[PDB]
């Protein structure tokens, strides 16, 4: 989990959300073993976005090749404990928009956050991904974690970009205010290997 100072920093950064604004949530991975989480406020562009190493490797490899394309080695350096830390400090009685509520409901409940309510926009599969190509063209650089070829060859599913494209689908245009991450990379990732000296 997080250190005392990491925990103070996270809570401080999370208060940059307005607890009342429209807020999307999306996860990749099963709710008992999530590997990527995004919480996004379209109007101001702010988002919480972080990763998690999986515990079930066989199911992860399946999800990797047919959904999110994440290589497990790229998760080794991510900061543990962020999922429970973030969910614990989301505002009381917060309301979240999502596309498909079943898994996210389980995840919040497992964290005793039954006070958090979900609004399932329940779009149809392809309506939800109308602007998938344009959103990936513009905002690919915001998440480079989907490195594997995914087959169902299709575009990998990213918690962050899914939130952005669902927002685009609800409003009818890929034109959204610039997304800005509220978490620092040093909170999402551990230090990683030293610079190779060249
Ligand atoms: Mn997704
Ligand atoms: Zn991603």
Protein described:
- This protein has 198 residues and is an alpha/beta fold.
- Helices cover 34% and strands 13% of the residues.
- The chain contains eight helices and six strands.
- It has helices spanning 4-14, 57-68, 82-88, 102-110, 125-128, 132-139, 159-171, 185-188; strands at residues 24-28, 36-40, 46-51, 95-98, 117-120, 180-181.
- The protein is globular, with a radius of gyration of 16 Å.
- Manganese (II) ion (MN) binds next to strand 1 and helix 7.
Number of self-contained structural domains: 1
β-strand percent reads: 5-15%
Tell me the structural class.
alpha/beta
Widest sheet, order of strands = 1-2-3-6
Q: Output the number of helix runs.
A: 8
Radius of gyration: 16 Å
* Order of H and E elements: HEEEHHEHEHHHEH
Into which percent range does the helicity of residues fall? 25-40%
The biggest beta sheet is recorded as:
4 strands, mixed
Number of strands: 6
Bound chemical compounds: manganese (II) ion, zinc ion
Query: What is the terminal separation in angstroms?
Result: 34 Å
Describe the global form: globular
What is this structure's SSE topology?
Layout: H1 4-14, E1 24-28, E2 36-40, E3 46-51, H2 57-68, H3 82-88, E4 95-98, H4 102-110, E5 117-120, H5 125-128, H6 132-139, H7 159-171, E6 180-181, H8 185-188
Parallel strand pairs: 3-6, 4-5
Antiparallel strand pairs: 1-2, 2-3
Helix pairs in contact: 6-7
The chain binds manganese (II) ion (MN) and zinc ion.
Zinc ion (ZN) is lined by residues 36, 143, 145-146, 158-160.
